[PDB]
Amino acid sequence: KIRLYQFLLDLLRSGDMKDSIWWVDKDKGTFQFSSKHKEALAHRWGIQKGNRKKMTYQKMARALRNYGKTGEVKKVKKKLTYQFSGEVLGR
DNA sequence: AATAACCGGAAGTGGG
DNA sequence: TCCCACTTCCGGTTA
Ligand code: NA
Ligand code: NA
Ligand code: NA
After folding, report:
1. CA dihedral defined by A36, A41, A44, A49, rounded to 10 degrees?
2. Which residues span the domain enclosing A45?
């Protein structure tokens, strides 16, 4: 099963949901969600996973917070903005 | 108030 | 047994 950080990186590479997520500085790996269109992206994550309940941005962000310690994705001090690690970006 | 971003402890689910 | 990688629940805080 695909991991959440990989799902997001794949979307950014494909450009399939450009109204919901975008790079801020791709060289640094920083990216940002749309305030008004993030829920559609969260719904897609839950359906891809086959989860029992509808996925929400809140639940997806709760999962994202767990990456802070291990480092794959860290929150940036800008609205709805996060940063992938160099390791995630290189693989 | 209404709206929304941000936080995380804890218990539940999946697939090893 | 017991960790993976989240998911779900419940709720609090800040702008
Ligand atoms: Na527990
Ligand atoms: Na409640
Ligand atoms: Na604000």
Report:
1. -130
2. 1-91
Q: Where are the beta strands (DSSP E) in A15-89?
A: 21-25, 30-33, 73-75, 81-84
Breaks in chain A after residues (C–N exceeding 2.5 Å): none
The protein residue nearest nucleotide B15, judged by CA to C1', is A1
How far apart are the CA of A40 and the centre of ligand 1, in A? 31
Q: Solved how?
A: X-ray
Evaluate if the CB of A65 falls below 7 Å from strand C: no
The rounded Å distance from CA A62 to ligand 2 centre is 18
**CA–C1' A62–B8 (A):** 9
* Number of domains present in the structure of chain A: 1
